[PDB]
Design a protein around this nucleic acid. Structure first.
Lengths: 452, 390
RNA sequence: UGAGAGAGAGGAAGAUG
DNA sequence: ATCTTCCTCTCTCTC
């Protein structure tokens, strides 16, 4: 876990200045702009009431930013409030609650290729290197014209951003459009939304490759957040896929969740499994007659022999194939459904017609969890959305959840404390919340309640 | 006060001896006001003319033929002058700056002992005007037209201009509360108050801002309409002697005009909102009941919140190293709006929400007894750490 | 005439079941 | 049944 030393000394020395671990103060391309919805009002919000110590800590950060030239003071005619986020580290984070802004701003998502068309490029590559720029946050200039829109307000101040803060609605497209612009003409570099992938077929050619990409970054006055990068290694991770020499295969397959879904022991476990299948009973040739061996065990008394074992695996196979599964498309209307709990999270992304109703599923999600459970469950939900990052990109969807912290985003006012730390990442998804209570959470629950 | 007297006598000096400048930016589409003056009586015009000279006297305004023309207002109390700038303002870009929260200043004082007070001499009038934008302040009196050379009260961004400036100069002194032109400073030891007084007087001297020495006090002051005592905060007798001696409500407004003034002092009146339930032979027992009627960061507290119907009650008290009481820092009460347990929970979260800017998060204790909107209630409750009581 | 703060009385329109 | 967002008005306070 020290892969920079792994690359030649002449490269180490050439780009030492731009492969840093902390952002130096601003040195001054394409910019981030904020186009407002015709007839929308920019926010004119007061700051949130915080305690003495907290505001001290708020001011500590404003200084660090002022000193970094990321913000200058404003006399802006609008303002958004601010939430201090107490990292797990003892440190602190200033998050600007740009929800009211984001509502009033147009979205211009940058069109990205299918991931599988990108992975097709790596071909017979032998070394890979990934570079992190943290999506160009705090680097990409705000458009001078649009800076006042970013204006935050603390209990005793009013500053505006000069570079691209977190929390703004079209951020990752800006960085995406940027990377396309600088790197689209190199057949050895894959770029998408986050990392830059560099692939070559020999470490010989690789250094000449890195030389070009790092130069181009250096000419953009960009900085590579070293600590995140992986340099010239055999294996690397990219776009949720595991990138190998000749082996590309996802970290969590489309159907892993239902495949490794454990065989039931308790009655309840079976009832939950059956309850899930029942939800998509429509997309399957007579599920009522093939769930019989199971349902009978649940119902009255019968042994869980290999006669249930067959029935289960027949129903699993039914969920992992058409017509339960639908070959995703770009113009589709998605809807994500998450239930998290003790121990684990499960979620389901499903297509929906012009009438809000099932056409099928696009992927299931499952993940185990390591305090309190209120905080831990939300992490689960974030990890589910994260999983579906590249598919939900550009799309408006509907997120169903029964997490009272996340649900507080329905109201315009100051959000619940337990959701505030995820305000910045949430802002990059374009979702409508919807409350969830069974039997609509039957799929998600079975996946959730049963971790593997 | 030996050395300080030497150092800042130059700025602690009545009358203003001859940088931040106020700006007035007009929204692109907008046109400036060319308004005709307000009607005035023969004896009002005299009171106007006596002030227009006083303004001309200290060289705050100059007679100038700007194209712009806003009308003037004569305010009773003595009689101050205010220009109606409402048409001007609607043509100027806004500029919202925070003003210190009052609940928030009273809560900072801690167990500070000796408080000095500074009064910025002639308020906004110590803030020059940017000459380019001077002509916009132009106003027609019946006599002739004038122009403010110095920041007049009653422009949109006027409080923000001064509130910024103050915030920037005094944001990082944990012993100084500066609310616009009023500046409190609170210390523990007299020794420590000297070093403190120097520091703020430096900054006031560094900006060539002037204190009106006559108008300020250097072990007990008054501030923001309150009276901050040594180990106490209590409402002053200035506003208390117009509260008992306020005529019993007979009219509709008077019923509101009474709840309205006793409002700002809700902090002191226990079960306040619950005793105004009538506000009619039962209105009388109520206006008389209310007429009758200390936060240190490091200390422990007890939030008590018994709440049934007809109200939700709560008081927060300072408690001994062991237990029981030390004092009271406020009483909270609200009207509404379903089972007591949930009714007593709403009482808790609306109470916690009230003192959140002190209680979140110290380890205090809760004295109290013992579905979606309750999930929410329960979630808010979770972010506080405490321990329930019988 | 200005900026915020508190308490209170009402009104109009939506969304998901 | 849940839950949003927008507006008018009354009384008061701080400077």
């Amino acid at each position: 876990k020290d892969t920079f030393c792994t690359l030649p000394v002449w490269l180490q020395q050439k780009y030492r200045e731009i492969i840093r671990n902390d952002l130096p103060p601003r040195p001054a391309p394409v910019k981030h702009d904020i186009e407002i919805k015709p007839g929308a009002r920019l926010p004119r919000l007061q700051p949130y009431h915080v305690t003495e110590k907290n505001e001290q800590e708020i001011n500590k950060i404003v200084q660090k930013l002022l000193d970094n030239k990321f913000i200058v003071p404003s006399k802006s005619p609008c303002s958004s409030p601010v939430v201090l986020v107490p990292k797990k580290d003892g440190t602190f984070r200033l998050c600007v609650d740009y929800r009211t802004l984001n509502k009033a701003t147009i979205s211009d998502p940058f069109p990205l290729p299918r991931i599988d068309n990108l992975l097709s490029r790596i071909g017979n590559a032998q070394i890979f290197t990934t570079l992190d720029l943290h999506s160009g946050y705090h680097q990409i200039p705000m458009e001078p014209k649009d800076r006042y829109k970013t204006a935050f307000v603390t209990p005793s101040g009013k500053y505006e951003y000069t570079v691209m803060p977190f929390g703004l609605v079209n951020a990752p497209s800006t960085f995406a459009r940027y990377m396309a612009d600088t790197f689209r003409d190199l057949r050895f570099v894959n770029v998408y939304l986050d990392d830059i992938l560099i692939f070559s077929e020999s470490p010989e050619e690789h250094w000449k490759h890195l030389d070009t990409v790092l130069e181009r970054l250096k000419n953009e006055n960009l900085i590579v957040k070293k600590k995140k990068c992986k340099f010239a290694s055999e294996e690397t991770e990219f776009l949720g896929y595991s990138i190998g020499i000749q082996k590309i295969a996802p970290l969590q397959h489309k159907c892993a969740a239902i495949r490794d879904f454990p065989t039931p022991k308790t009655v309840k476990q079976a009832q939950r499994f059956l309850g899930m299948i029942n939800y998509y009973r429509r997309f399957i040739p007579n599920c009522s007659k093939i769930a019989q061996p199971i349902q009978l065990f649940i119902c009255d008394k019968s042994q869980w022999t290999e006669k249930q074992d067959k029935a289960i695996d027949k129903l699993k196979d039914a969920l992992c194939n058409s017509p339960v599964l639908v070959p995703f498309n770009n113009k589709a209307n998605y809807r994500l459904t998450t239930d998290a709990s003790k121990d684990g999270i499960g979620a389901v992304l499903e297509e929906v017609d012009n009438k809000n109703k099932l056409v099928g599923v696009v992927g299931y999600f499952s993940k185990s969890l390591e305090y309190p459970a209120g905080e831990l469950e939300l992490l689960g939900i974030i990890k589910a959305l994260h999983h579906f990052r590249y598919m939900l990109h550009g799309k408006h969807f509907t997120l169903r959840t029964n997490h009272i912290s996340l649900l507080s985003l329905q109201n315009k006012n100051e959000p619940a404390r337990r959701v505030q730390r995820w305000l910045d990442d949430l802002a990059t998804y374009d979702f409508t919340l919807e409350y969830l209570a069974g039997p609509k959470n039957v799929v998600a629950d079975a996946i959730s309640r049963a971790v593997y």
